[PDB]
């Protein structure tokens, strides 16, 4: 009916799905997300990798870094970049946000992205929400600007929900 996590030795029931754990494809043991030093974001992303990418515990992993760790790292960057290129390639948003005049604009977001400094979906989305909301606060009551900013806002939210279904973009602290 159960066993113990091979790392922390806490017990678990085979039928208890109210936990955050991964099951090793080789020994069948379950390991806590925390025991692999995985954040909640990474656990969600891991849950979405292809079935062909098996999780393997520390005991059953013969080659380090484990294949799932490589796939997870790449999947995160790919997913983030996906959203960023879609914005950079969007005429309207690029127009209004890529170049302005800590990321002050989408170009700043890219430099950060390229330097490999983005790990958190929350931080990435927050940086973009800040840029969008900043444009909105300075619409100047100009109606064509508002319509435009409202459109890039919905576009961003849709891009985020599709790439990161488990993430609440609408809850961002930076929306006003």
């Amino acid at each position: 009916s159960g066993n113990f996590c091979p790392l922390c030795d806490k017990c678990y029931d085979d039928d208890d799905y109210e936990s955050k754990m991964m099951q090793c494809g080789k020994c069948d043991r379950w390991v806590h997300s925390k025991c692999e030093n995985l954040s909640d974001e990474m656990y969600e992303i891991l849950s979405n990798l292809p079935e062909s990418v098996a999780y393997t515990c520390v005991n059953c992993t013969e080659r380090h870094p484990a294949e799932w760790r490589l796939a997870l790292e790449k999947e995160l960057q790919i997913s983030l970049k996906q959203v960023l290129t879609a914005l950079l390639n969007s005429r309207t948003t690029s127009h209004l946000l890529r170049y302005r005049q800590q990321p002050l604009d989408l170009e700043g977001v890219k430099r950060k992205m390229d330097q490999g400094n983005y790990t958190s979906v929350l931080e990435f989305s927050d940086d973009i929400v800040k840029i969008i909301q900043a444009a909105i606060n300075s619409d100047g009551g100009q109606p064509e600007i508002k319509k435009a900013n409202s459109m890039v806002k919905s576009f961003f939210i849709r891009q985020m929900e599709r790439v990161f279904p488990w993430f609440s973009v609408k809850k961002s602290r930076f929306w006003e």
């Binding site: 799905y17 109210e18 754990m21 494809g25 656990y43 799932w68």
Partner: peptide, 6 residues
Amino acid sequence: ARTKQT
């Protein structure tokens, strides 16, 4: 990768 969510 199999998780409790999978």
